[PDB]
């Protein structure tokens, strides 16, 4: 029984921006979730649609680990039925979501004196993101009647803005690393199981 490589997702050196959130499929393995929900490193550990203890006792056809970085006061937005720039234009969870959301402060790694601007998020979009949708268009958005030709202008805007991650920022504006585990069960044979 080869163990599920959760350390690859959780202990990654670099994390992706929320608009370009990374997805890793976890399959054909046994996952010990006790080492996750016991750890005090996580500021947020909330499971929707399934209890943390039963995670070990259940098998699932596919497991998805979505990883990204946001700022503190936005961690609440990774939850079904949430509204906001992250949930509307960057990363949206469905109403029938089944899985868990884990978030931990990463100021010691993702913040730099003078500002860390490697982490971006989408400000504008014509329509709200569908659940589990990724947008990397980085095209010049239009918010006015005047048309545009990929040229920044009066009503032509770049759709992406970078977080200013500095160690002196407040907790709400400090970088938090977020991993979302999605446990989905199809007619396909089960691949990921826990102990028992």
């Amino acid at each position: 029984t080869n163990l599920c490589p959760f350390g690859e997702v959780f202990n990654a050196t670099r994390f992706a921006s929320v608009y370009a959130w990374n997805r890793k499929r976890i399959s054909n393995c046994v996952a010990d979730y006790s080492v996750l929900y016991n750890s005090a490193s996580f500021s947020t550990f909330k499971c929707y649609g399934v209890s943390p203890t039963k995670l070990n006792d259940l098998c699932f056809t596919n497991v998805y680990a979505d990883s990204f970085v946001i700022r503190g006061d936005e961690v609440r937005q990774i939850a079904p039925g949430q509204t906001g720039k992250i949930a509307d234009y960057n990363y949206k969870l469905p109403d029938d979501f089944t899985g868990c959301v884990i978030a931990w402060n990463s100021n010691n790694l993702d913040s730099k004196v003078g500002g860390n601007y490697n982490y971006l998020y989408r400000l504008f979009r014509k329509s709200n993101l569908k659940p589990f949708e990724r947008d990397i268009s980085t095209e010049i958005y239009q918010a006015g009647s005047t048309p545009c030709n990929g040229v920044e202008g009066f009503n032509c805007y770049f759709p992406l803005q970078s977080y200013g991650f500095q160690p002196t920022n407040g907790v709400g504006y400090q970088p938090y690393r977020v991993v979302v585990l999605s446990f989905e069960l199809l007619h396909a044979p089960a691949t990921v199981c826990g102990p028992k």
């Epitope: 929900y37 016991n38 550990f45 909330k46 499971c47 929707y48 649609g49 399934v50 209890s51 943390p52 203890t53 039963k54 939850a79 079904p80 039925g81 469905p94 109403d95 029938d96 979501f97 089944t98």
Partner: antibody, heavy 129, light 110 residues
């Protein structure tokens, strides 16, 4: 992302009325909890009944003794039925949405549905002759 | 079984002042306490959840503090539009019950 209520009207004492909370922009999935909150004219808010879509069960207020029945009619509709209507039931009725989730603790696993972010405009129920 | 005692029934302060509303739970509710603003003829509007977390779009002059059986909502830099009724709602996970406070009215002194 919307909650619209209907069914309020003048009803004679001792009758029974059903109220309907309609969801718009979202589904009544297993992650949500619906509660009916009632406030009398010039008085505070009280929770009447709650439905837990995740478990398929319900919770009712202490002052209610079988007089309240809250049911899920559709994926976007929830009904509240009240019997033996008295003057103390004369009030405005809101349906509120709460997000339920699991956390781990020393007792074990805990289901939390702590606050109501989304409310409806409400409907007024008047019980008099 | 759980009571939320909210006091005083009315708080007053001039524009730019600070009002404090106290809410005491009969038994410990951990951090699960919420504050709601209500204007007449309107649904309650959520201000604070988890007893200290500001809802997005709510100004920072609304601050919730406390835990266990004692909570406070402080409104500094009072504006004229702050005149409304404010409620505290506790959640007891053991009984899955939602208890609302009596309510407090904010009066803008002038």
């Amino acid at each position: 992302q919307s909650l619209e209520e209907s069914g309020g009207d003048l009803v004679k004492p001792g009758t029974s009325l059903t109220l309907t909370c309609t969801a718009s922009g979202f589904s009544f999935s297993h992650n949500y909890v619906m509660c009916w909150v009632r406030q009398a004219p010039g008085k505070g808010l009280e929770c009447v009944a709650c439905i837990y879509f995740g478990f398929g069960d319900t919770y009712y207020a202490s002052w209610a003794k079988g007089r309240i029945t809250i049911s899920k009619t559709s994926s976007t509709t929830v009904t509240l039925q009240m019997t033996s209507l008295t003057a103390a039931d004369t009030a405005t009725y809101f349906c509120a949405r709460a997000l339920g989730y699991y956390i781990y603790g020393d007792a074990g696993d805990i289901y939390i549905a702590d606050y109501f972010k989304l409310w409806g405009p409400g409907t007024l129920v008047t019980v008099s002759s | 079984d759980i009571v939320m005692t909210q006091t005083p029934a009315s708080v007053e302060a001039a524009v730019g002042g600070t009002v404090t509303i106290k809410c005491q739970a009969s038994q410990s509710i951990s951090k699960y306490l919420a504050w709601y603003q209500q204007k007449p003829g309107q649904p309650p509007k959520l201000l604070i959840f988890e007893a200290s977390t500001l809802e997005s779009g709510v100004p920072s002059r609304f601050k919730g503090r406390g835990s266990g059986t004692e909570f406070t909502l402080t409104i500094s830099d009072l504006e004229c539009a702050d005149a409304a009724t404010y409620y505290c709602q506790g959640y007891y996970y053991s009984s899955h019950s939602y208890v609302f406070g009596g309510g407090t009215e904010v009066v803008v002194k002038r």
